[PDB]
Amino acid sequence: YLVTSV
Amino acid sequence: RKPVSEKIMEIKLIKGPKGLGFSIAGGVGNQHIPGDNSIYVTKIIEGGAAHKDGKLQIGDKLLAVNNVCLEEVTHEEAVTALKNTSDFVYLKVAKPT
């Protein structure tokens, strides 16, 4: 559900 | 029900203008794979720091960032760890094997 680019 | 082996590896990344150049999914309450709370690498940007370094791979579990352990943490806790970094970041990962 949550995806994060870093 | 069979044994599952992983190779544990440390990867040092230096941020570029666009950061580390990968994405993470997973976490407690945000499972990337049913029954698994691990933080997983799900994207690697072409030309980005992770890509150029060449060690990090999609499918890798992210076990730690610097001195912060990411085993059984929420996605939010993983993001918090990655947000609070300098231009040099030490990742501990587990690769399939």
Author numbering:
A (entry chain B): 2838 to 2843
B (entry chain A): 310 to 406
What text comes from the article?
Dlg1 is a MAGUK protein family member localized to polarized structures including epithelial junctions, stem cell cortical regions, and neuronal synapses. MAGUK proteins adhere to a common domain architecture comprising one to three PDZ domains that bind target proteins, an SH3 domain, a variable HOOK sequence, and an enzymatically inactive guanylate kinase domain. One example of a molecular bridge between the membrane and the microtubule cytoskeleton is the complex formed between Dlg1 and APC, a protein that binds polymerizing microtubule plus ends in an EB1-dependent manner. Collectively, the Dlg1-APC-EB1 complex mediates a dynamic link between polarized membrane regions and the microtubule cytoskeleton.
Here I report the crystal structure of the Dlg1 PDZ2-APC complex determined to a resolution of 2.0 Å. This structure shows an extensive interaction between PDZ2 and APC that spans the ultimate six APC residues and highlights additional binding determinants that likely promote the PDZ2-APC interaction. To examine the molecular basis for the Human Dlg1 PDZ2– APC interaction, the Dlg1 PDZ2 domain (residues 310–407) was purified and complexed with a peptide corresponding to the C-terminal 11 residues of APC with an N-terminal TMR fluorophore covalently bound. Strong electron density was evident in the PDZ peptide-binding site and the final six C-terminal residues of the APC peptide could be assigned and built into the electron density. Nestled in the hydrophobic groove is the APC peptide in a β-strand conformation, running anti-parallel to the adjacent βB strand and parallel to the αB helix. Specifically, the APC V2843 carboxylate group makes hydrogen bonds with the backbone amides of L329, G330, and F331. The APC T2841 side chain hydroxyl makes a hydrogen bond to the H384 ring Nε while the T2841 Cβ and Cγ atoms make van der Waals contacts with I333 and V388 respectively. V2840 contributes to the anti-parallel β-strand interaction while the backbone spanning APC Y2838 and L2839 is stabilized by a hydrogen bonding network with the Dlg1 N339 carboxamide group. In the Dlg1 PDZ2-APC structure presented here, αB is displaced, opening the PDZ peptide-binding furrow, enabling APC to bind the length of the furrow. The order Q340 confers to the βB-βC loop orients the N339 side chain towards the APC peptide, promoting its hydrogen bonding to the APC V2840 backbone amide and carbonyl.
